[PDB]
Every structure is written in structure tokens, then in C-alpha cells.
């Protein structure tokens, strides 16, 4: 074809394909083109450099020259055409100023957050309120003792992470001032993190999930109470031996690549980092333990008034208004220090500031006690997703499939068994019963939608299998009611 269009390289015309896409970058010195994945750059650098300046030139051309900071109050901090526009939440200018008025945001009430000294008190207060089934307030636990939450011994830091995970492990990382996400080698982040004096840009990753790393997955685990209620954990039990065999023998096995991986995250952020208001995907609950550093959460209860304000905030193109300034005083401030743990139920809207370099272990999960609220957040996400175009990776992996499997593999069996004896589930399983109805009703809406306009992309559950599950669900449900009407 044309030699000048050859990478690079690579020395090739069409790249094999993290994902190079179909993208090239050109050397401002030697003028030869490079596939992005062949340029030696990482995704986080793609937009940074005004001049580049490939490896075949750096020893005799110098390092790439990055754009000069022209508009520190804009995500596009490098664009002179935006100099005159408004301060964007949370650009460098925005965060800088927010840090100074920050502590004026009111503290939460006792009904919003409950602070406890240790895991034993948490347990007591958790049970007073009705436990996980009736879990509505956030808890801060100062000392983790009694939580049964496996964590690293301090002295553990970023260095240990990169050693365990791998220097070339790529993690989706937030460019804080640009308010965007890019891949970045763990070793690159560590270099940048290590340099505490020279930080032209701040970085914060939330999304290093290590549940598939045989070493890390043993070092930081969710509290026991989280493991006991996790729907994902119930469906993909990390069991062995005969238990696993029984698993396969019932059609209860689910592929590892279908497992939502969100329950074991490592988060590391630079001081000055800000993450803006959001509800965790799928309306999942969150555990959040500070190994090192400090975090300030700004939180708002999952009420309809708040949900309406949030939905509007998320669908408006406006970029200059802090959600707290329009939430009618719903935003409360809570500080979490080294060693302390936050436990957040479904639906809580929250932003977070990182006053100090930090290292956090956290995780997301779904549970039956928050089923309604999880569906409610799901409707919220879908409503927002109609207006704005986002990426599927920022939403809960395989949300619907997870429920099809939970209904099939868990609830169906429980209802069937009760039906086959006595047996009014309201006695020793009121919770299981009410969840079944709630989940069923939601899934009836999904079914009708799939019929009205067809299935989504390829896989994973054929429409026919869904209809067969629903038929079986309706049957056992109708039977159990008859038993409840009789008794």
C-alpha cells in the first residue's frame, strides 16, 4: 500500500487488534506513524503531549512536551478556547477552592449515620435496627476488631500491591483534574505516587479488583457479614471438593467469566483527589476500609427527593454546579481516618475528597435486604442512560443475568421446597418470600420489555430459558399463596 502509513512498530499496516482500537499517533520529530499500542505511551498519556517524540528520538530529541496548563478550572485544562468558561466540578481550581470551605458542610444525623467503636458494637446496633434485611443507615466503625474482616497489617502499602499484582498490571485510573478514566500500569502509578513533590496531575484509582489474584484475594476480604449476604457470593461459592461436585451435578455451576467482579477492590488516591457524586452501580452496598490515609465522604440519603435531584444533576450538561448546592441541605459530611471502616447500604449518593495520600480496601455487593432499593437505583441508572451515553463498564456487570440465576438457583428451590411440605414461608422465611415477589415483579417487567423490543446483544440467557424460569416461578409462587390463603 504505502510505506509512510506503516507502523512503527510493529512494522505493520494493520494492528493485530489494552485495546488498540484503530488508532495511530504521529511523531512530531521523525514524522512516522505509530499504532497507539505501539507508541510506548499508556492510555493516560494520549492527550497529555503537545509534542511527541517517540522512542526512536528521545535520546536525541528529548522527552515529549506536554501542553501547558491554560485553563486549570476546566477538564480540558490545556485548551485556551475554554479560558473564559465556568469553573468545572471538580477541576484543579474547583478542588483547590473546595478544600477551603469543605468543612462547612453539616454533619449527618443519628438516623443517617451511626458511629460505632468496633465490630462488636456494630453487630449489636446492626441487630437492633433489624439487621441486613432492614438496612438503611450508614455505619462508621472506628476499630475493625469484631468485624471478622481480613485486612493487611499496616506496613503494607502500595509497594506490596505492585509486587503482588505485577508492575505491568493495568488499572483503570481517574485523571482527577480531567475527571476521566484511563489505563495506567501499576508501576507507573507507583512512580507518580512516590513523587510527592512533583504532581502536575492527580490520580486516583478505584477499580483495581483482585478477587482473581490467588495471593491478594486472601490478604483483604469483606467482613464476614458481607460474605454471608452477598448475592454474588451465594451464586459463585468459592467451594471445593464434593461441595463443588454437587454444585456441577445440580445445574448450579456458573462460569467464572460471568461472575461480577466487584467485591474486592483496592483503591489508592493522591492527596487532593476528588470523586464526584454518584450512586454505586446496581445500587450495590459498599464496605470501605482505610489502610492508610484519610477520606471525607459527602453523602445524601436515598430518598425520592434526593433521587430526583441526583437524576437531574446527572442528565444536565451543566458542569459548574456542585450537587450539594442544589440538594436542599441533604448533603452531609463524614470523615474516615486510618484504620476506620465505612459500611454503606443501597442507594446512598456520595462524593469523596482525599485530603491525604491513601490506600483503601473496599468492595461492592448486592443483597436481598436491599432488593427494592437496588431495583430503584437500577431504574435511576436506566433513566439516566436514556439521556446520556456512558460505557457499560461503569455499571454493574451482568446485573440482570445475576437475578435470573438467583431466582432460578436459589429462590425457586426454596419456594418449591416449602411448597412440597407444610408450609407457610412467612414463619421461618418471611424475608425469602417477600424478596421473591419483589424480584419476580421486576423480572416480569424485564421479560415484557425483551418481548416488546427483542433481546439485547448475543448471549447469555436465551429468551426461551427466561420464559421457562418465569413459568416455573409463577407456578410455585401461585401455589405458596394458596397455602397462605388456606392457613
Amino acid at each position: 500500500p504505502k510505506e509512510s502509513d506503516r507502523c512503527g512498530g510493529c512494522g505493520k499496516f494493520t494492528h493485530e487488534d489494552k485495546k488498540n482500537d484503530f488508532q495511530w499517533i504521529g511523531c512530531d520529530s521523525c514524522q512516522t506513524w505509530y499504532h497507539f499500542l505501539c507508541s510506548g505511551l499508556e492510555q493516560f498519556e494520549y492527550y497529555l503531549y503537545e509534542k511527541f517524540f517517540c522512542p526512536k528520538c528521545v535520546p536525541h530529541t528529548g522527552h515529549s512536551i506536554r501542553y501547558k496548563v491554560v485553563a486549570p478550572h476546566r477538564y480540558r485544562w490545556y485548551s485556551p478556547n475554554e479560558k473564559h468558561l465556568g469553573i468545572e466540578v471538580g477541576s484543579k481550581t474547583w478542588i483547590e477552592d473546595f478544600i477551603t470551605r469543605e468543612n462547612t458542610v453539616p454533619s449527618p444525623t443519628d438516623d443517617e449515620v451511626c458511629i460505632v467503636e468496633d465490630g462488636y458494637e456494630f453487630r449489636r446496633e446492626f441487630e437492633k435496627l433489624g439487621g441486613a434485611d432492614n438496612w438503611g443507615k450508614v455505619f462508621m466503625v472506628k476499630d475493625m476488631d469484631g468485624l471478622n474482616m481480613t485486612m493487611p497489617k499496616p506496613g503494607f502499602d502500595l509497594e506490596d500491591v505492585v509486587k503482588i499484582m505485577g508492575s505491568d498490571y493495568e488499572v483503570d485510573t481517574i485523571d482527577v483534574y480531567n475527571q476521566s478514566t484511563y489505563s495506567m500500569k501499576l508501576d507507573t502509578f507507583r512512580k507518580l505516587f512516590r513523587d510527592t513533590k512533583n504532581r502536575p496531575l492527580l490520580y486516583n484509582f478505584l477499580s483495581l479488583e483482585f478477587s482473581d489474584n490467588n495471593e491478594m484475594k486472601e490478604i483483604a476480604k469483606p467482613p464476614r457479614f458481607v460474605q454471608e449476604i452477598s448475592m454474588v457470593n451465594r451464586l459463585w461459592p468459592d467451594v471445593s471438593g464434593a461441595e463443588y461436585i454437587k454444585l456441577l451435578q445440580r445445574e448450579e455451576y456458573l462460569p467464572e467469566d460471568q461472575r461480577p467482579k466487584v467485591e474486592q477492590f483496592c483503591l489508592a488516591g493522591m492527596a487532593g483527589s476528588y470523586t464526584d457524586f454518584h450512586v454505586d452501580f446496581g445500587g450495590s452496598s459498599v464496605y470501605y476500609h482505610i489502610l492508610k490515609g484519610e477520606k471525607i465522604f459527602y453523602i445524601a440519603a436515598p430518598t425520592e427527593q434526593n433521587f430526583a435531584a441526583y437524576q437531574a444533576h446527572e442528565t444536565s450538561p451543566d458542569t459548574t454546579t456542585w450537587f450539594g448546592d442544589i440538594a436542599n441541605g441533604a448533603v452531609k459530611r463524614v470523615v474516615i481516618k486510618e484504620g476506620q471502616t465505612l459500611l454503606i447500604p443501597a442507594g446512598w449518593i456520595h462524593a469523596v475528597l482525599t485530603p491525604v495520600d491513601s490506600l483503601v480496601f473496599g468492595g461492592n455487593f448486592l443483597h436481598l435486604g436491599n432488593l427494592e432499593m437496588q431495583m430503584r437505583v437500577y431504574h435511576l441508572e436506566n433513566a439516566i442512560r436514556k439521556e446520556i451515553r456512558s460505557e457499560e463498564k461503569f455499571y454493574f456487570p451482568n446485573f440482570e443475568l445475576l437475578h435470573w440465576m438467583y431466582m432460578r438457583n436459589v429462590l425457586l428451590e426454596k419456594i418449591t421446597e416449602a411448597n412440597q411440605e407444610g408450609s407457610d414461608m412467612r414463619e421461618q422465611e418471611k424475608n425469602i418470600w417477600t424478596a421473591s415477589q419483589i424480584m419476580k415483579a421486576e423480572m416480569e417487567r424485564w421479560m415484557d420489555r425483551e418481548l416488546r423490543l427483542g433481546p439485547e446483544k448475543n448471549a447469555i440467557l436465551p429468551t426461551d430459558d427466561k420464559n421457562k424460569i418465569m413459568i416455573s416461578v409463577r407456578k410455585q409462587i401461585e401455589i405458596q399463596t394458596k397455602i397462605q390463603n388456606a392457613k
Partner: peptide
């Protein structure tokens, strides 16, 4: 930087 997509 100057880039392109194919």
C-alpha cells in the same frame, strides 16, 4: 499530539 483513527 496528532492522531488518527482507522
Amino acid at each position: 499530539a496528532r492522531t488518527k483513527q482507522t
